[PDB]
Amino acid sequence: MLPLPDFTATFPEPFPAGPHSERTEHRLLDWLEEHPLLPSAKAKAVLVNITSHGASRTFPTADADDLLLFAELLLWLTAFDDVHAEGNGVGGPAALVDRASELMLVLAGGNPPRAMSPFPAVLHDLLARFRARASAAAYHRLAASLRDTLMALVWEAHHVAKPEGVALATYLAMRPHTVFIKTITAAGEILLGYELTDTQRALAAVRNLETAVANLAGWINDLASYEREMQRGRGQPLSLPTLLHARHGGTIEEAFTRASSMCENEAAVARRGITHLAHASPNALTAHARALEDITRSFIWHTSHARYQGI
Amino acid sequence: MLPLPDFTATFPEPFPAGPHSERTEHRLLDWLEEHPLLPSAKAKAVLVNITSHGASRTFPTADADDLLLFAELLLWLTAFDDVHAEGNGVGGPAALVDRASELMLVLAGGNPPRAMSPFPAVLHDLLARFRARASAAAYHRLAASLRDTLMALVWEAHHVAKPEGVALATYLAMRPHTVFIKTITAAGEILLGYELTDTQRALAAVRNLETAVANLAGWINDLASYEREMQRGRGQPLSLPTLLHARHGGTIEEAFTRASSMCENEAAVARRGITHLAHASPNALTAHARALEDITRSFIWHTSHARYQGI
Numbered sequence: 001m002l003p004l005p006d007f008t009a010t011f012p013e014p015f016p017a018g019p020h021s022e023r024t025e026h027r028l029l030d031w032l033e034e035h036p037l038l039p040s041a042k043a044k045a046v047l048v049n050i051t052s053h054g055a056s057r058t059f060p061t062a063d064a065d066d067l068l069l070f071a072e073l074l075l076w077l078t079a080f081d082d083v084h085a086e087g088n089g090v091g092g093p094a095a096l097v098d099r100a101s102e103l104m105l106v107l108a109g110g111n112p113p114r115a116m117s118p119f120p121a122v123l124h125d126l127l128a129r130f131r132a133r134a135s136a137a138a139y140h141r142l143a144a145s146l147r148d149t150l151m152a153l154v155w156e157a158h159h160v161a162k163p164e165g166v167a168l169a170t171y172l173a174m175r176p177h178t179v180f181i182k183t184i185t186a187a188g189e190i191l192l193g194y195e196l197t198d199t200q201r202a203l204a205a206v207r208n209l210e211t212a213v214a215n216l217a218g219w220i221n222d223l224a225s226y227e228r229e230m231q232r233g234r235g236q237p238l239s240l241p242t243l244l245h246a247r248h249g250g251t252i253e254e255a256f257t258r259a260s261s262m263c264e265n266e267a268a269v270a271r272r273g274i275t276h277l278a279h280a281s282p283n284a285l286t287a288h289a290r291a292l293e294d295i296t297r298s299f300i301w302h303t304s305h306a307r308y309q310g311i
Numbered sequence: 312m313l314p315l316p317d318f319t320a321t322f323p324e325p326f327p328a329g330p331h332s333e334r335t336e337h338r339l340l341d342w343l344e345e346h347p348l349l350p351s352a353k354a355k356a357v358l359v360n361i362t363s364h365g366a367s368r369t370f371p372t373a374d375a376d377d378l379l380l381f382a383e384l385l386l387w388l389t390a391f392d393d394v395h396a397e398g399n400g401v402g403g404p405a406a407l408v409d410r411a412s413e414l415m416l417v418l419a420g421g422n423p424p425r426a427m428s429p430f431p432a433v434l435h436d437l438l439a440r441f442r443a444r445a446s447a448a449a450y451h452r453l454a455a456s457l458r459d460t461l462m463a464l465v466w467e468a469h470h471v472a473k474p475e476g477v478a479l480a481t482y483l484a485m486r487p488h489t490v491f492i493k494t495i496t497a498a499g500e501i502l503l504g505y506e507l508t509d510t511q512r513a514l515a516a517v518r519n520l521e522t523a524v525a526n527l528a529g530w531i532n533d534l535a536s537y538e539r540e541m542q543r544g545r546g547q548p549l550s551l552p553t554l555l556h557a558r559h560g561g562t563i564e565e566a567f568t569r570a571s572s573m574c575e576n577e578a579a580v581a582r583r584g585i586t587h588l589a590h591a592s593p594n595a596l597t598a599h600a601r602a603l604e605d606i607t608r609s610f611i612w613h614t615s616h617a618r619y620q621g622i
């Protein structure tokens with residue numbers, strides 16, 4: 001069972017998906033035969049599916065080409081998380097640090113030594129295509145979001161063995177960086193062809209909406225992933241219900257009820273923020289509100305995927 | 312003894328120091344009583360001295376105010392390295408990861424939870440003053456350089472216990488990030504009031520000079536710091552002579568001879584690169600060549616300081 005959040009009042013189904021979902025899924029499989037990032041063909045098929053079909057919901061406006069770019073970056077990042085991070089790879093946190101440091105060198109520019117992992121070179125190519133498409137500031141924001149995620153995955157890898165050693169407030173601030181929401185949005189500004197001034201980014205209305213969408217994305221993933229993340233060998237995962245259970249005692253069921261209330265409140269904040277920003281102003285504050293709405297709908301959609309709940 | 316590199320033909324003494332060296336040293340001590348980053352008053356005095364007097368050589372053009380900003384950032388970063396990183400702090404690599412993750416949150420923007428270390432809040436204030444002074448792209452480059460350094464300090468902390476487990480080529484690519492040269496230069500573009508186009512940064516002449524200055528800064532620090540870094544309890548440090556000694560066998564003296572040859576060659580490359588770029592073009596390629604020359608002279612200067620060789 002486990003109580004789950006109900007978004008009917010804030011983000012009702014269905015979530016619009018754009019056209020190019022099945023082509024993207026095929027062009028992603030051709031790309032991956034050219035750059036094998038996943039060991040298993042089974043794992044590859046599930047991840048290619050949720051990425052392509054999820055990307056259709058994240059950016060319904062699209063362009064079959066722009067969509068494939070974003071889908072390739074998101075699959076690259078998720079595959080890296082799944083192969084190396086969260087303790088999935090051997091060698092402990094130290095091996096992830098070595099892999100993350102190679103990627104930092106790609107991000108810093110100026111040809112680093114060749115790596116025997118394929119992830120650095122793919123990232124190099126992906127960043128090249130995004131740099132050509134984005135403004136200078138927009139690329140920098142994409143690159144920053146990725147640098148921050150790498151530090152946060154290193155952080156997570158040092159705490160998965162003892163999730164109870166993490167304070168709830170630290171987890172809530174770190175989780176937006178491990179759920180990739182900042183990279184998704186920075187990629188969205190590029191591909192949807194808009195960009196906010198640094199003064200607009202400082203607006204409370206803009207920050208409060210971005211915070212609520214980041215919280216909601218991480219928390220719903222935590223709830224949707226808890227059973228799968230649990231069925232592995234290790235104990236409780238480093239995630240929201242585990243920390244609420246440690247904080248309040250009681251049962252996991254009551255932790256999920258608490259988390260589900262947290263998520264519904266956060267969805268209400270996000271809905272109200274989308275309405276404020278969409279009620280016109282600069283066209284950049286709209287479009288951004290609409291970009292964040294579709295990103296949010298796609299995160300709610302992907303919790304029903306096989307990657308999380310099987311059948 | 313230990314053979315050391317001779318830069319007389321490439322970067323002869325003396326190195327010009329600007330005027331405001333002693334005021335900066337006093338204004339730094341007043342700042343630190345307001346924000347204690349160093350435990351000891353002895354440690355504080357040495358570090359304030361080399362930072363203020365070194366900063367006078369790094370940016371002779373100056374402005375007593377602009378100089379104090381840069382000096383505060385460089386002292387903040389060096390104090391963080393000295394207190395938490397390279398194994399100086401207890402709790403192993405994991406404690407440094409937690410401290411670095413707090414700083415990543417400062418860099419990402421949007422108020423993280425309050426930390427009980429003072430380093431995050433000082434960084435928050437320092438970044439605020441640099442954002443007001445720099446262009447949007449220039450601030451982003453400063454912030455990126457700092458993100459990259461944090462990952463590289465985390466990397467170093469995972470390898471100091473077994474320096475021989477590091478390949479020479481990996482160390483050479485990582486060391487520019489732990490010697491802080493990229494932050495120094497990005498701060499210089501801001502404070503000297505210039506900035507390169509992304510196409511200029513791609514010029515071979517610009518990249519080859521930046522690489523040679525980064526190599527030289529890290530390597531001369533390695534050689535100057537080897538005796539001090541050795542006199543601690545642990546064995547050989549994670550640094551150039553240690554890795555050359557492991558690569559070639561032989562003696563530490565022959566490793567230092569090899570490293571000294573590497574440094575003199577690199578200084579010759581840097582000198583030739585400074586001449587090419589200074590021979591006019593856009594005024595931005597000059598000034599940059601001159602900025603890098605002064606940065607390089609300051610790194611050579613600071614190897615004679617008490618922080619490295621005592622008396």
Ligand SMILES: [Mg+2]
Nearest residue numbers: 081085086178
């Ligand atoms: Mg993860």
Ligand SMILES: [Mg+2]
Nearest residue numbers: 081082086225
């Ligand atoms: Mg996962």
Ligand SMILES: [Mg+2]
Nearest residue numbers: 221222225226
């Ligand atoms: Mg999950």
Ligand SMILES: [Mg+2]
Nearest residue numbers: 392396397489
């Ligand atoms: Mg160091």
Ligand SMILES: [Mg+2]
Nearest residue numbers: 392393397536
């Ligand atoms: Mg040191």
Ligand SMILES: [Mg+2]
Nearest residue numbers: 532533536537
């Ligand atoms: Mg040193």
